[PDB]
Amino acid sequence: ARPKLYVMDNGRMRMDKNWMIAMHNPATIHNPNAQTEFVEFPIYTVLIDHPEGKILFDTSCNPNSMGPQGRWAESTQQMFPWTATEECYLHNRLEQLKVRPEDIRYVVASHLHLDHAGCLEMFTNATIIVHEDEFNGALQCYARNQKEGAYIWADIDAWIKNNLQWRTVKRHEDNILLAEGVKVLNFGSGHAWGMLGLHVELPETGGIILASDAIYTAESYGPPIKPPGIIYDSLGYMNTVERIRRIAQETKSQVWFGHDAEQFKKFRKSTEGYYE
Amino acid sequence: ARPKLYVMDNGRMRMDKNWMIAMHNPATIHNPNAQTEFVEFPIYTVLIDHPEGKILFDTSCNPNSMGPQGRWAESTQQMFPWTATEECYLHNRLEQLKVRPEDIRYVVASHLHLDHAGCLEMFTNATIIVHEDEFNGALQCYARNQKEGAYIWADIDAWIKNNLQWRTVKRHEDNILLAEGVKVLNFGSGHAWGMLGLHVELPETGGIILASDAIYTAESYGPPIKPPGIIYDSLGYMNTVERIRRIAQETKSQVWFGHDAEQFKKFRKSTEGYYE
Amino acid sequence: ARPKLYVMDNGRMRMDKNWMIAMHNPATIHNPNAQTEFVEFPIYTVLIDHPEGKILFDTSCNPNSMGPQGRWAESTQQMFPWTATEECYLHNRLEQLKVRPEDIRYVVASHLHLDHAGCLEMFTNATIIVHEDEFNGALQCYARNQKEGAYIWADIDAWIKNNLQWRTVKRHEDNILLAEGVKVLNFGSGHAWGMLGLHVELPETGGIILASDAIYTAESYGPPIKPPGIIYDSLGYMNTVERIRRIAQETKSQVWFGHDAEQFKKFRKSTEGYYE
Amino acid sequence: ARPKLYVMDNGRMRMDKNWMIAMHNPATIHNPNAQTEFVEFPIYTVLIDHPEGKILFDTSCNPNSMGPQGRWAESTQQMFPWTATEECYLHNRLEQLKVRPEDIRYVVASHLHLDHAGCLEMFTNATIIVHEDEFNGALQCYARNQKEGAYIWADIDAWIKNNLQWRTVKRHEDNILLAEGVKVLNFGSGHAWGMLGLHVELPETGGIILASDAIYTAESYGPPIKPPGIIYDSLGYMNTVERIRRIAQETKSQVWFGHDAEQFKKFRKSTEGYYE
Amino acid sequence: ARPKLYVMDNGRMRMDKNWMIAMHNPATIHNPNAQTEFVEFPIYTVLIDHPEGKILFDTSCNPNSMGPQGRWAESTQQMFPWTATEECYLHNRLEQLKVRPEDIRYVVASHLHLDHAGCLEMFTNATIIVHEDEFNGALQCYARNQKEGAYIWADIDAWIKNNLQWRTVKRHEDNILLAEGVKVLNFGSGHAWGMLGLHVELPETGGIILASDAIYTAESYGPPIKPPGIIYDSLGYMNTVERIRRIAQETKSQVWFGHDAEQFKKFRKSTEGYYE
Amino acid sequence: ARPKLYVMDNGRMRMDKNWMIAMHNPATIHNPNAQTEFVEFPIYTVLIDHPEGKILFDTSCNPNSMGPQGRWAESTQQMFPWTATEECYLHNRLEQLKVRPEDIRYVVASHLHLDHAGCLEMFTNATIIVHEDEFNGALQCYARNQKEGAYIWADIDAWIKNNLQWRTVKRHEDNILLAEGVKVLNFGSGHAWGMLGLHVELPETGGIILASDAIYTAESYGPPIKPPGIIYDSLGYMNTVERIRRIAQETKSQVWFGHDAEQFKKFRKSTEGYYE
Numbered sequence A, B, C, D, E, F: 001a002r003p004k005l006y007v008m009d010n011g012r013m014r015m016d017k018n019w020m021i022a023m024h025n026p027a028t029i030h031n032p033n034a035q036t037e038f039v040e041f042p043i044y045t046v047l048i049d050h051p052e053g054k055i056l057f058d059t060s061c062n063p064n065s066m067g068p069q070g071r072w073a074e075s076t077q078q079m080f081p082w083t084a085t086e087e088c089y090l091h092n093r094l095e096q097l098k099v100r101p102e103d104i105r106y107v108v109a110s111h112l113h114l115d116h117a118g119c120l121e122m123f124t125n126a127t128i129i130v131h132e133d134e135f136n137g138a139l140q141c142y143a144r145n146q147k148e149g150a151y152i153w154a155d156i157d158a159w160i161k162n163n164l165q166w167r168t169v170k171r172h173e174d175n176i177l178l179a180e181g182v183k184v185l186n187f188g189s190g191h192a193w194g195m196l197g198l199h200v201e202l203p204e205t206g207g208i209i210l211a212s213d214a215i216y217t218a219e220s221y222g223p224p225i226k227p228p229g230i231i232y233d234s235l236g237y238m239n240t241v242e243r244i245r246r247i248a249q250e251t252k253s254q255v256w257f258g259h260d261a262e263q264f265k266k267f268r269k270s271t272e273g274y275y276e
């Protein structure tokens, strides 16, 4: 297999850095009203054009997320503002590669947060691979009519109405060989209820681990590890980071973080090329 | 048994409110430089004058904690400054009750943070009851010569030099009946590596749960639960709070939080009287 | 507390006895085309009129289950036909007791099968108590647009649209004291993904265990245990039956089965009276 | 290693199809007396003539199983009748290959049901590899003098009298490398108390998974999975099937089912040749 | 209920003290050939004459254990010699109380060692309660034709021939209420594969814990704990001792050790009376 | 990589054989005062001179262990006397190889017993790899001021004073790839609280497993396994031995025992050469 891997730029988000790095700048006796920072970071997705079929990792934000008629609650829009030109919409990024949503065989959902599962509803011809615990959690949000938070009611509503085809990764399930040199990593609970990663073995580029929000940035990764300001399973989060570090060492793989602005700038984007 | 329970005021501490309540005031697009605050809370201990023997819950901060010649690292002093008059020192609070350290049969260490284990070194004639995971973690800090953090090297140094007598509560150990109507609750991992609580049944007052840092404040308790800005085991923390809520319901017990300023002000202090 | 407990007759169902008792009559060399039986059994619910608030255990079938315009798939209607006069509808049974749906404080859903969770949508003023694993499973059925089976898409649709208030019993959660002498038993996985039971302690009647489909009938119960023809967690099912037997012995409680025609006939129904 | 693999025909069995496929033909309102059928399936064993030593997988039924003087209880004979010519007896099948029981180094007992462990007593010069949970269960049947069921008292009696040499596979034991390209798969609880499979890697044929009763037939395998009418551990059974499906995918292995009539007919029998 | 509890003297055993207390007298540079000692200890059983039925705890050694025609292997006889007069045989001890074997409702087998399970074969009218792991272990000894060790082949042979009625305590099974004030304690693995204890609440005497070999002697009990020279599950053993210590404290119960010569001297034997 | 592996002779120890092999010579009716023996065995360490960095496995005893001014308690010196010439001190063994302590990158502590962790304090430039459970246990010994036993207070004191850099292997952590063909095996609890082994793949010599005290001698190894006279976790110990047996078979590796005098005689020592 001689696949091509694309990094697609799906815009920028901003939020309190305390979300990204817990207690990054604590108040002190001489600085008791310490102020935080409003940091900008990239939202991106990865397409693997594989001979066995096209694989998509994450789906960024829904084009109708922001605005007064948006899907995101006002509170969400104010705390996690997403900025994207039409060019940045996943549909458009794929189109520019002559890829239609119906051409996607597998979508790997790292998790079901607003900035990763926004465009799942588009892929009605794919098998959507998601952690069963993440799926369960999101559905509870939906059933409980939770309108605020990182799980977008309107997005979930759309997944159901569009009759997506789901394959859940069970809590105690081994990693999944999706195709030659493409492995779905079952990270389990940490950042969210259930995290999935990807290990890609490219002929000329070698090993790549897509960590998503298992590791926000190089600052998160360290060492030492700097966990995010809010977290589902702290123990699971720390275990997952260490696990990724081990896999990276043993397989001589690069680790691609969820939202590292510096790393993202160095990526070859879909407007410039790909990784073979 | 007709026991007397005393609440002893061991001064005040201040810190970033984000420590207490995670992401209490997140930055927004309109408030991108959102400032935190430096909140003040009480440090206190509880003495149970029981016919079977005096039981002490927590030990506050060491009198030699703060200052240029202090045991606390300068960074620790600036992030978590402790203010206390001489009358606030545990040794002094006990003396006013005509109680000598040598008189204490049991000391229950909720955990070994600087604001709870400060004066353990005093009680050389007692059995020190602590969670085995907490003890292990603290000892690792010592062995690794960790100077910064919530575990004070000089304090641990003194515990060893004073040849304290330890009984560790095992990770999977049942609750311990210390005395008639006094039970050590094995909360396990959460806020710290290993948390212990206390349930006291007084003839007149009824049930009291000493939660310590298992629950910082009423705001923490909710519902809904508002967890602290940092946390060892998030899942364990949440489980522990809900467990306490259940025990309180089933036993019709009051819940005494670790550091609730408003609750503390309503307590009858050792200088005014006791509970029976 | 001097509560009154009512048994409400919510009609009759029929199905292959092999569903109820696995391999009840296996084919043999001399009877190779052994035929099954189509057995009839009661659907019922229990109301506990408690001074602390009214508690409802199970909700039977939705009045619009059967028929060409019914909610149940044709296949379901043919395999599990429900027969009920208007008098048998839960709404009507409650009305005859001068109880309105909005008067119900707690609904305990043993599980979310079609014959137990049919009328959940009515109780918009209650807290609905359900096993988290059962809730998760049902929601997946909904999200996956599963139209056939024991989980009714239309029913689930209604729960969400009616904005029911859910309290999920966690997989490893202790039993819940709902009110004086009313305990929700966390049976876990067996018959379905997550089973809840009830133990009621009545002043004059004594102990009652509501087992629901944890135990179909006296034939199921034995001894020896005769498990149902289809089952989620066989090991969990067997463990649960034995657990109920132990609780029954230790608390001298009656066991009320899910669908025992003989036992049901002996019950004092809501048209005759109640249990104090 | 250039091993030869032989498939040995050990006759036919019949039973209620409901045993094979649970609720295969449920009663309906239009067919309330739905009849089952008495399906016929093969009993077979596999001999691996390996340079490191001959390995036998399963041992079929004891030649003294059926008849008025038979080891099988009359009830067992009528529910699971076994038909076999003399040429079908394992001892005879081996003799035709010029293989004596004393020549067998290893016998892998998938489990200890009457149709798999029938002739263990023959192999007194071999190490008998069996799951420890299966061995324990079988021995309990013996000790409890259980005359009915799938565990034949007289067979077990003979194992003990013939002083067979056992190696039990522990519940949490890794797969066992028996010989070059021969691995015992520890499937654990499911169909029975403890299931063992085999993965064979042949130079010419490639990968073969002997699943035995972990998967009865292609119908069982699906997807979707159609489980048997009775089952020890339903969760374990489902997990095992999916595990086998994964192993088959990852190793590009064929899956040989326990009792698939159509698959068996396509096999090259020991009377025609072997696999290499 | 007003039961009578009898202690029955079933003779004396001797063995290397190192069996009783591990490394009781280690070799030193000044004593490199350190000598052990051959200590004597009692074998005893407990009959609870309960209004609900007679309960027997342990059964001592089989009368045909010792001698050239004895069931015990020569090595066993030389390492663990049992000395008992005819009066000491359990059958005779019972007969002198006007109790026939057929009169026993329940036999609780602490474990199946030669000195506890010797006379099980007598009680063909009782339910024999044993830990499932202990039962499995013993049966494997039998099936493997182990004619040496602490599990007597001939004894096990007799259990099966005499068609004893077994009720196994499952590994993760709760304590069993056998009768008013009589509870079987599920100790689990430790001394052996599966240990059972008994807690008896007598109206006049109060609480008694029958520890059997969970605790050999007061020396074993300490504290500190001094474990035996050979042990199946060291961690389980230690946990069990501490569990017994807790139960004893919480229930104000006496602990009756397995083989404490000094304690056994102080008991009232069946020749002088009983405990009420 | 072309590493050189050195076996360094760090003297001889003697102790009661009962420590090495539990109940090796039990008392009998004809030998009631059976004598033990005082057996001698080697203390040794392994240096892997790897291109990626020098790796040291174990560190033998501290040079100031024995004598009236020694670190070892008198009781310890008499029970476990260590005899070593100056040439046998690790520091000198290393010096003769032109290796300074500061030259060591990694020290793998199999465990922290007196005969393995004696010279840890020398390697202030290395990362010290130890099992977290072993580390915790030793530190508790120190904090509890245990001045007897297999954990040397003065040794631990020195580790902390010398500011060693620790990397703890977590209880549920995978094996660690330390360098090309060098893997730390996480054996877990058994002989001690937490055992670490090493697997080395040498280009010329092939596979070597350093078992340390996971397996004392070939007699320990069997089969059958003959466990030591004292043991932390008997089940863990047995599991570990069998695990090592499996690894050895699957990787065609030699197993180097902790203290096998006969095996150690056959090794090439650092005075004669090395293994490539």
Ligand SMILES: CCCCCCCCCC(=O)CC(=O)N[C@H]1CCOC1=O
Binding pocket: A013, A015, A019, A080, A113, A114, A115, A148, A149, A150, A213, A230, A259
């Ligand atoms: C009840 C609503 C509370 C509002 C805050 C809760 C949001 C959950 C915290 C979180 O994970 C924020 C988030 O989803 N951030 C994105 C941005 C980077 O990757 C993320 O996870």
Ligand SMILES: CCCCCCCCCC(=O)CC(=O)N[C@H]1CCOC1=O
Binding pocket: B015, B019, B113, B114, B115, B148, B149, B150, B213, B230, B231, B258, B259
């Ligand atoms: C780089 C280490 C030093 C930075 C401090 C991080 C340790 C924070 C641990 C924590 O939970 C803070 C703390 O101990 N707070 C006190 C105040 C209230 O009760 C507490 O635990």
Ligand SMILES: CCCCCCCCCC(=O)CC(=O)N[C@H]1CCOC1=O
Binding pocket: C013, C015, C019, C080, C113, C114, C115, C148, C149, C150, C213, C230, C259
């Ligand atoms: C894909 C649809 C398959 C149709 C059969 C599946 C139904 C699940 C089996 C079952 O539990 C039937 C059921 O729900 N029966 C009711 C009647 C008595 O209590 C019950 O659980």
Ligand SMILES: CCCCCCCCCC(=O)CC(=O)N[C@H]1CCOC1=O
Binding pocket: D015, D019, D113, D114, D115, D148, D149, D150, D213, D230, D231, D258, D259
């Ligand atoms: C009352 C006990 C006797 C009734 C028989 C019940 C045992 C059924 C166990 C089973 O799974 C049937 C069985 O062994 N079938 C064979 C045929 C195919 O492979 C098998 O396991």
Ligand SMILES: CCCCCCCCCC(=O)CC(=O)N[C@H]1CCOC1=O
Binding pocket: E013, E015, E019, E080, E113, E114, E115, E148, E149, E150, E213, E230, E259, F023, F024, F026
């Ligand atoms: C090293 C050869 C010994 C032969 C194997 C016999 C196993 C002995 C282990 C044991 O526990 C002996 C035993 O059962 N002793 C009785 C006597 C006191 O209570 C006992 O457990």
Ligand SMILES: CCCCCCCCCC(=O)CC(=O)N[C@H]1CCOC1=O
Binding pocket: E023, E024, E026, F013, F015, F019, F080, F113, F114, F115, F148, F149, F150, F213, F230, F259
């Ligand atoms: C019964 C009094 C003994 C004093 C306590 C010392 C503990 C001895 C336990 C042990 O394992 C001794 C030890 O560490 N021996 C060394 C020598 C061989 O490898 C070892 O483990």
Ligand SMILES: [Co+2]
Binding pocket: A111, A113, A191, A192, A213
């Ligand atoms: Co996220």
Ligand SMILES: [Co+2]
Binding pocket: B111, B113, B191, B192, B213
């Ligand atoms: Co704290």
Ligand SMILES: [Co+2]
Binding pocket: C111, C113, C191, C192, C213
């Ligand atoms: Co149901």
Ligand SMILES: [Co+2]
Binding pocket: D111, D113, D191, D192, D213
């Ligand atoms: Co079978």
Ligand SMILES: [Co+2]
Binding pocket: E111, E113, E191, E192, E213
């Ligand atoms: Co014993």
Ligand SMILES: [Co+2]
Binding pocket: F111, F113, F191, F192, F213
């Ligand atoms: Co050691």
Ligand SMILES: [Fe+3]
Binding pocket: A113, A115, A116, A213, A258, A259
């Ligand atoms: Fe994100």
Ligand SMILES: [Fe+3]
Binding pocket: B113, B115, B116, B213, B258, B259
């Ligand atoms: Fe605190």
Ligand SMILES: [Fe+3]
Binding pocket: C113, C115, C116, C213, C258, C259
């Ligand atoms: Fe039902």
Ligand SMILES: [Fe+3]
Binding pocket: D113, D115, D116, D213, D258, D259
């Ligand atoms: Fe079969």
